[PDB]
């Protein structure tokens, strides 16, 4: 009839009852100090609360605090004092613990959604996931957890309905318990599914543009590709993109090809052009394809692995676009070792340096011609230094993605620790819902109910072990 029933399991002699009391007190105090440490290092750091991706850390710690302090409070009113709790105090205590667990699950929910938006929609992440939106969503989750916790205090106790209610929880009705555990279990299984999908899909896509999936060597693959196109060996150039006027300078490339067709070095310059669009530019490309034997034009839709094979086979890639907001084509080319000769516009300005490719003016067939003959002259010597420099430059643009994967791994670790800690306890409530029990099941309920405080203990250890930024912030105080 009282919260904190320690008088059960009379095996505890007074020689060890004080030991149990002092270990529970020290564990509760340790959890409280760890949680306040996590909050104060979060709030004294500008770089941690300004990132929404870390926000749930604070939320998680706050939820664990609701499991810590309440426990300590509940441990004082029965040993240090002997105040018998009424219905209101028992309802408040049980509501606080249930609110702590539900807020933990909801924080994992919002963290999973943020991870999906960050990893698999990286262009939309910095505009969708804002700080006010994340704060509002966390507040809404906390308030709905608080409301569903405090529902029995508003008149959903079992003496009001005049019906049968639970035995391990006096003044708690059966229907409220099964509804709460159903909601929490459904949300937990959804989060397991979501994190599994996020980590699975990002594994097969983050590392796709790399030569580790390409067999053979450079010159052998180039010779096989050029024989596949019915050409001899030579300095190869590539273009892939949309066939339109205004976005990508395919017409600039065609004018440059026409200009180089009148020169004496066109026999050492093979060209591949991939794309589709307006019929006039397609017709011009096809006319240059039939006029010269060393220019190949592909119109049909291609597979991603075919483009990966093409990037690591050709020597140079031309990106003469007018408006390039992202330059993903440059990243995919440079990751596979293909020296770019691109236009210095948009996102192409700050990705190619003076030692990682050649830069031209936008919409300049003459400057493109000069750069392509300069690249032809440069290709006479060795080129492996430029290939390794481009690989080092382009692999340095995926560092944020790898840290996002590491954060998602940390979140999966936190989720499975929470699952391990709260599994058997919610299983005891499940078996309470379906069938009665004896005193042994209540005993193991009381024994494994300390796993909640153990979860609150081990969460800041995971936070300090995994996060480098949090570790550096903690090392900044001393």
């Amino acid at each position: 009839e009282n919260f904190m029933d320690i008088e059960c399991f009379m095996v505890l002699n007074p020689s060890q009852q004080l030991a149990i009391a002092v270990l529970s007190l020290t564990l509760g105090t340790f959890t409280v100090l760890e949680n306040l440490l996590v909050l104060c290092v979060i709030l004294h750091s500008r770089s941690l609360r300004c990132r929404p991706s870390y926000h749930f850390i604070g939320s998680l710690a706050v939820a664990d605090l609701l499991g810590s302090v309440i426990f300590v409070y509940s441990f004082i009113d029965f040993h240090v004092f002997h105040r018998k709790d009424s219905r209101n105090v028992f309802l408040f205590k049980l509501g606080g613990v249930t609110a702590s667990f539900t807020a933990k699950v909801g924080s994992l929910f919002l963290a999973a959604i943020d991870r999906y938006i960050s990893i698999h929609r990286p262009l939309a992440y910095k505009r969708i996931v804002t700080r006010p939106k994340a704060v509002v969503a966390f507040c809404l989750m906390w308030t709905i957890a608080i409301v569903i916790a405090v529902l029995p205090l508003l008149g959903w106790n079992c003496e009001k309905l005049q019906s049968v209610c639970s035995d391990i929880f006096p003044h708690i009705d059966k229907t409220y318990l099964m509804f709460w555990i159903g909601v929490v279990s459904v949300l937990l299984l959804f989060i397991v599914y979501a994190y599994m999908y996020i980590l699975w899909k990002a594994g097969i896509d983050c590392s796709f543009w790399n030569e580790s999936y390409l067999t053979g060597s450079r010159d052998e693959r180039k010779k096989s590709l050029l024989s596949k196109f019915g050409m001899d060996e030579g300095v190869t150039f590539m273009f892939i993109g949309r066939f339109d006027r205004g976005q990508k300078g395919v017409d600039v490339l065609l004018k440059a090809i026409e200009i180089l067709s009148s020169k004496k070095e066109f026999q050492e310059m093979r060209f591949i052009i991939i794309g589709k669009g307006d019929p006039e530019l397609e017709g011009w490309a096809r006319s240059l394809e039939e006029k010269h034997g060393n220019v190949k034009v592909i119109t049909e839709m291609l597979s991603r692995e075919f483009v990966r094979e093409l990037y690591g086979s050709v020597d140079f890639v031309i990106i003469p676009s007018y408006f390039e907001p992202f330059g993903l084509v440059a990243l995919e080319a440079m990751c596979l070792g293909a020296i770019p000769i691109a236009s210095a516009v948009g996102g192409l300005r700050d990705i190619i340096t003076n030692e990682t490719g050649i830069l031209v003016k936008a919409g300049d067939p003459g400057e493109l011609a000069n750069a392509i003959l300069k690249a032809l002259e440069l290709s006479r010597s060795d080129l492996s230094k430029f290939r390794e420099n481009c690989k080092k430059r382009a692999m340095s643009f995926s560092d944020q993605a790898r840290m996002d994967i590491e954060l998602a791994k940390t979140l999966v670790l936190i989720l499975v620790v929470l699952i391990i800690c709260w599994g058997p306890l919610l299983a005891i409530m499940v078996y309470d819902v379906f069938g009665k029990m004896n005193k042994l099941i209540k005993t193991v309920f009381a024994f494994c109910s300390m796993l909640c405080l153990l979860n609150s203990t081990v969460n800041p250890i995971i936070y300090a072990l995994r996060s480098k930024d949090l570790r550096h912030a903690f090392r900044s105080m001393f």
Partner: nanobody, 121 residues
Framework: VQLQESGGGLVQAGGSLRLSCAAS????????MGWYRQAPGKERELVAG???????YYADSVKGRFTISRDNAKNTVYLQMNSLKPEDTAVYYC????????????????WGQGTQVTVSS
């Protein structure tokens, strides 16, 4: 997705105008957005484009007189033009492309109905 445009009509020469285009998508809607113009009996031309921040492109014939802005709270684009010249009488379309991060060749483009802009001297 669905796109709605507003701001067409007749403008006295030398004036200024605001065009608005709103999109209804499910996740951020369009990644990149743009305004196109089509003169009567002429091909479409890229007159404005933006993704976010300082990623604005204006054509060489409209540079310095056309500015593009994007509001992300309502997911819309605004085109401001000033000192209009009578070769700008055209049907303006709102184009919105989502582009895939995994494969740079993939893109999906969506279009508006277009509004007629007649500038008269």
């Amino acid at each position: 997705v669905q796109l709605q445009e507003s701001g067409g009509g007749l403008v006295q020469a030398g004036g200024s105008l605001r065009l608005s285009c709103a999109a209804s998508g499910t996740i951020f809607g369009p990644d990149v957005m743009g305004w196109y113009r089509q003169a009567p009996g002429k091909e479409r031309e890229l007159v404005a484009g933006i993704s976010n921040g300082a990623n604005t492109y204006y054509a060489d014939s409209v540079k310095g007189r056309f500015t593009i802005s994007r509001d992300n709270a309502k997911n819309t684009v605004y085109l401001q033009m000033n000192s209009l010249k009578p070769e700008d009488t055209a049907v303006y379309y709102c184009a919105a492309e989502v582009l895939d991060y995994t494969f740079a060749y993939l893109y999906h483009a969506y279009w508006g109905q277009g509004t007629q802009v007649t500038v008269s001297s």
